[PDB]
C-alpha cells in the first residue's frame, strides 16, 4: 500500500520557496483497520493561505492539514461510512488516510481547536454544472460562510448599506453578490490592489475602497465615509484591523456585524486578523462571530445546495476555483498563493 | 468657582508611583452653559485597575477618566436632566463637570470605544441599607455584569457545574453566589492566592482552584478535572488565557460560556485578557460577550434594584466596598488596589 504525503520539512515564516518548507514522503503501509476506522483515498485537497501559519505549529515530519474530499475504499465493521462514499473532512495533503471520522481536539497551537467531524457528501448534490470539487468551495465551508451568514444572521434589508472587507476573496465576493440580491441599497467592498477595483464592480458592488492593512485608521475612515455617505447598516468582516475600527465609527442604529473566525497566526509575533469582543460594547449593535461548520446541519446543507446550488446551476452566481491536477502539484499550487492575504481562502484546490 | 481635577502627569507602565503618574490641577472658572449642558458636582468616583492602561492612553495634562456619581447643580434650558438629579456617568476624577450627558466616541486607544450616555439614578432605589454609592458597584455596571449575565444568558440550572475565573473579584464572587442560588450543583472558582480561597467557600463556592497566569496549561487542566469531575456546564470568564483554554477541553454538550468585555490591555507590548472569537468554532456550545451597559434599560435596572437589591437588604447577598473620603484621597485609593487586601477591600470608591 503506497501512501504519499507532503510533510513539514522546516519551520519558515512566509517564505516563497515551498520546497524548503515541504517535503514529499512515500512509504508502504500495512493497513489493519480498527473496527470503526475507514481507509480513504484523497480526491481533492484545499490549498489556503493559512497553511503557512499551520506549518509553523505542525511537528517536523508531520503532514500538512487541509480540507479534503475523500473516497471510502475500506470500512471496518463499526465505521461511520460505507465503501464507495464520498466524504469531506480535514484529511490533509495525503494520498490516503486512515481515520474514523470523529472530531479532533487539537490543543498545541495558539488556541485550542476542534476539527469538525467528517461528513458524507450526498451523491445527488453534484453534477456537471456543480461538480464534487465545489464541496471545498461554494458548496462547502467557504460558500456556507457567506451564504449561512446572509440567511441566518445578517438580515440585509432593502436600501441597507452593506460593507464587505476582504471583498476580493471568494467568500467576500459571494457575500457582496448575495447582498445585492437581497436588495441592498449599496454594497461597498474593500481591497488592497486597484487591479480588482474595476473587477469588483464588475462582479457586483456599488463601490470599492482601496485598503492595505498598514493604512491609517483615519485614512480608511475617510475613504469609507465617501463610499457610504448614509452610514453603514451591515458589516461582513473577513479582514479585521484598521478597516473594522473605522466601520464602527459610522454604524447606523440597530446595525448588524458578522466577524469571521480565522485560523490564529501571528505576523511580527502578535495576532492580527478579525476581532470581536472589543467591539461588543458599542451601543445598539448586534455582532455575531461566524464559523461555517456551525451550520453544517442536514437541513441547512440541503437548503444551500438547493437555493445557492440552484443559483450556480442557472448561471446567476459564479465562484472562481482553480484546480491543479496531480498530487505532485501541491507545492506549485501553494506557491501560487504568495501575495494572497489570509481572507483569500477557498480558491485553490488540487485534484489527486 | 474652583474646579479641581486629577490629570495624567506622565506615562509609566507597570505598578506606577501614583505621585508620578497623577497631578492635581486647580482652576478658577466661571460657568457658561450651552443650552443642553449641565454643571455636575461629583459625589463619588470609582478607582479601578484598568485606569493604569487608560492613563497610558490619556494625553498628558488630561483628567483621568472614571465612572462616577454626579449631581446636577445647574442646567441649561435644553438639558437632559434637572437640578437635583443624581446621575451616573464617566465623569472622571474632577470635582465638577460640565457636560451634556451624551455618549462619547473615543478613538485614541488600541480599539475605538463609546463611553455610554450618562444615566439618571432613581433616588428611591437607594436608602440606608443600599446606599447610592452602590450605583458604582453592585447596583451599577459591576453588579449588572454578574446579575445580567445570570438572568439573561447563562441559564444555570439545578445540578449544573459552573466555573468562574477570577472568582475573587467583586463580579466573580457575585456570580458564584447567584449561581448557587439558582441551584448549581457545583460552583468552582479560580483565584490567584490561597488566602482568599476560604472566604469564597463562605460565599457559596464548592471548590477553589488556585491559578496564577503563567501556570502550566496541563496542571490547570488536571486541577479543573478534579474540581469539576462531571464536566463543565457553565463558564463565567473574567480572565481569559490558560484557564479558559483548559475549560474548553471539558465543556459538556450544550454548554454556555460568558466572556466579559474588559478595557483593552497590553502586557509587555503583547496581548492578554479574555478572548471570544477563537472559541466560537467549538461545536455544541453557546458563547456570549458580556458588557453590562447593554442591559441598562428601564425595565432591567428596576428589576435588578428590586430583586438583587432586595437580596442585599435581606442579607441574602453579601457585598463589600471601601469608600475613601476626600477628592485628595483619590490617588491613594487607586494605589490601594496594588497593595494588599483588595480581595478583602472589594470595590474601592472615593466620596467627594
Residues of A in contact with B283 (CB under 8 A): 103, 114, 116, 293-294
Query: Domain holding A191: CATH number?
Result: 3.40.50.720
Residues of B in contact with A245 (CB under 8 A): 107, 111-112
The 8-class DSSP code of residue A117 comes to P
Considering only CB atoms, A264 lies closest to which of B259, B278, B283, namely: B278
Inside any domain, residue A311: no
Cα separation, A236 vs A189, in Å, equals 10
Query: Domain holding B92: CATH number?
Result: 3.90.180.10
Sign of CA dihedral A104, A107, A109, A111: positive
Q: Are residues B155 and B271 in the same domain?
A: yes
Buried b (16+ CB within 10 A) or exposed e, B284-297: ebebebbbbbbbbe
Cα separation, A46 vs A30, in Å, equals 27
Cα separation, A272 vs A239, in Å, equals 9
Q: Length of chain A, please?
A: 352
Q: Are residues A100 and A169 in the same domain?
A: no
Alpha-carbon B240 to chain mean position: 16
The C-alpha angle A263, A103, A153, rounded to 5 degrees, equals: 55
Alpha-carbon B191 to chain mean position: 17
Neighbours of B179 (CB within 10 A): 27
Give the HSE-up count for residue A245: Cα atoms under 13 Å, Cβ half-sphere: 18
Cα separation, B142 vs A126, in Å, equals 54
Provide the domain count of chain B: 2
Residues of A in contact with B294 (CB under 8 A): 280
Inside any domain, residue B182: yes
Rg, C-alpha atoms of chain A: 21
Cβ neighbours of residue B226 closer than 8 Å, sequence gap 6 or more: none
How many residue contacts between A and B have a Cβ separation below 8 Å?
82
Inside any domain, residue B261: yes
Residues of B in contact with A270 (CB under 8 A): 270-271
Considering only CB atoms, B113 lies closest to which of A217, A271, A281, namely: A281
CA distance A244 to chain B (A): 10
Q: Are residues B196 and B277 in the same domain?
A: yes
By residue range, what is the domain housing residue A272?
141-293
Q: Are residues A109 and A41 in the same domain?
A: yes
Q: Are residues A169 and A126 in the same domain?
A: no
Going through B77-193 in order, the beta strands assigned E by DSSP cover 86-89, 96-99, 104-106, 113-115, 119-121, 161-164, 186-191
Going through A195-280 in order, the beta strands assigned E by DSSP cover 207-210, 232-237, 251-260, 266-267, 270-271
Inside any domain, residue B307: no
Query: Bridge-partner residues for B346, per DSSP?
Result: B321
Q: Are residues A116 and A185 in the same domain?
A: no
Are A23 and A7 contacting, i.e. CB atoms less than 8 angstroms apart? yes
Inside any domain, residue A314: no
The residue out of A293, A312, A339 marking a domain boundary is: A293
- Inter-chain CB proximity A112 and B271 less than 8 Å: no
Cβ neighbours of residue A55 closer than 8 Å, sequence gap 6 or more: A8, A11, A21, A22, A64
Inside any domain, residue B314: no
Buried b (16+ CB within 10 A) or exposed e, A153-173: bbebeeebbbbbbbbbbbbbb
Residue B264 vs residues A289, B54, B93, B104: alpha-carbon distances, Å: 19, 9, 20, 17
CA distance A89 to chain B (A): 15
Q: Are residues A158 and A282 in the same domain?
A: yes
3-state secondary structure of B28: strand
Residues of A in contact with B119 (CB under 8 A): none
Q: Are residues A53 and A160 in the same domain?
A: no
Residues of B in contact with A275 (CB under 8 A): 111, 277
Cα separation, B144 vs B170, in Å, equals 11
Cα separation, B65 vs B92, in Å, equals 4
Grid cell for residue B80: 437632559
3-state secondary structure of A20: helix
- What are the backbone angles phi and psi of residue A265, rounded to the nearest 5°? -135, 165
The residue out of A247, A277, A293 marking a domain boundary is: A293
Considering only CB atoms, A114 lies closest to which of B112, B217, B283, namely: B283
Cα separation, A13 vs A193, in Å, equals 23
Cα separation, B59 vs B56, in Å, equals 8
DSSP for B85-109? -EEEE---SBSEEEE----EEE-SS
Cβ neighbours of residue A181 closer than 8 Å, sequence gap 6 or more: none
3-state secondary structure of A114: strand
Q: Are residues A78 and A166 in the same domain?
A: no
Burial, A152: exposed, middle or buried (Cβ in 10 Å; 0-12, 13-18, 19+)?
middle
Inside any domain, residue A262: yes
Q: Are residues A133 and A154 in the same domain?
A: no
The residue out of B273, B291, B309 marking a domain boundary is: B291
Inside any domain, residue B304: no
Q: Are residues B113 and B185 in the same domain?
A: no
Considering only CB atoms, A280 lies closest to which of B112, B280, B289, namely: B289
Selected residue of A224, A275, A281 to mutate for chain B interface (largest B Cβ count, 10 A): A281
Q: Are residues A168 and A226 in the same domain?
A: yes
CA distance A115 to chain B (A): 9
The C-alpha angle B201, B203, B207, rounded to 5 degrees, equals: 30
Are A188 and A162 contacting, i.e. CB atoms less than 8 angstroms apart? yes
Residues of A in contact with B245 (CB under 8 A): 107, 111-112
Cα separation, B111 vs A219, in Å, equals 16
Buried b (16+ CB within 10 A) or exposed e, A64-92: bbbbbbbbbeebeeebbbeeebbbbbbbb
Write down the experimental method used for this entry.
Answer: X-ray
Are B105 and A282 contacting, i.e. CB atoms less than 8 angstroms apart? no
Query: Bridge-partner residues for B72, per DSSP?
Result: B40
DSSP for A177-197? HHHHHTT-SEEEEEES-HHHH
Selected residue of A272, A277, A284, A294 to mutate for chain B interface (largest B Cβ count, 10 A): A277
Of B131, B27, B95, give the one whose Cα is nearest residue B327.
Answer: B95
Amino acid at each position: 500500500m503506497r501512501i504519499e504525503k507532503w510533510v513539514v520539512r522546516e519551520h519558515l515564516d512566509g517564505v516563497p520557496d515551498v520546497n524548503r518548507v515541504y517535503e514529499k514522503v512515500v512509504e508502504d503501509v500495512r493497513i489493519d483497520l480498527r473496527p470503526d476506522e475507514m481507509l480513504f483515498r484523497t480526491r481533492y485537497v484545499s490549498v489556503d493561505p493559512y497553511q503557512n501559519g499551520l506549518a509553523l505549529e505542525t511537528p517536523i515530519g508531520h503532514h500538512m492539514g487541509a480540507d479534503s474530499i475523500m473516497e471510502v475504499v475500506e470500512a471496518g465493521p463499526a465505521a461511520a461510512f460505507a465503501v464507495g462514499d464520498l466524504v469531506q473532512g480535514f484529511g490533509g495533503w495525503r494520498t490516503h488516510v486512515v481515520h474514523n471520522g470523529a472530531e479532533e481536539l487539537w490543543t498545541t497551537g495558539i488556541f485550542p481547536m476542534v476539527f469538525p467531524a467528517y461528513r458524507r457528501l450526498d451523491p445527488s448534490w453534484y453534477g456537471e454544472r456543480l461538480p464534487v470539487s465545489t464541496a471545498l468551495g461554494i458548496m462547502g465551508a467557504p460558500g456556507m460562510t457567506a451564504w449561512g451568514t446572509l440567511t441566518r444572521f445578517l438580515e440585509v434589508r432593502p436600501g441597507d448599506t452593506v460593507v464587505v472587507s476582504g471583498a476580493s476573496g471568494s467568500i467576500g465576493t459571494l457575500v457582496g453578490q448575495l447582498a445585492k440580491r437581497a436588495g441592498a441599497g449599496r454594497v461597498v467592498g474593500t481591497t488592497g490592489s486597484p487591479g480588482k477595483a474595476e473587477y469588483l464592480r464588475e462582479l457586483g458592488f456599488d463601490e470599492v475602497v482601496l485598503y492595505t492593512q498598514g493604512d491609517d485608521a483615519e485614512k480608511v475612515r475617510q475613504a469609507l465615509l465617501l463610499a457610504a455617505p448614509d452610514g453603514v447598516d451591515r458589516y461582513f468582516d473577513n479582514l479585521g484591523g484598521t478597516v473594522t475600527d473605522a466601520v464602527f465609527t459610522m454604524l447606523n442604529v440597530d446595525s448588524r456585524v458578522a466577524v469571521c473566525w480565522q485560523w490564529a497566526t501571528t505576523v511580527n509575533g502578535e495576532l492580527t486578523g478579525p476581532r470581536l469582543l472589543p467591539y461588543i460594547m458599542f451601543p445598539r449593535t448586534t455582532i455575531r462571530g461566524i464559523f461555517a461548520q456551525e451550520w453544517f446541519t442536514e437541513p441547512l446543507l440541503a437548503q444551500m445546495h438547493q437555493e445557492l446550488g440552484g443559483l450556480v446551476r442557472d448561471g446567476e452566481i459564479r465562484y472562481h476555483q482553480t484546480v491543479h491536477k496531480g498530487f505532485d502539484e501541491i507545492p506549485a499550487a501553494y506557491r501560487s498563493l504568495y501575495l494572497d492575504r489570509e481572507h483569500n481562502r477557498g480558491k485553490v484546490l488540487v485534484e489527486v
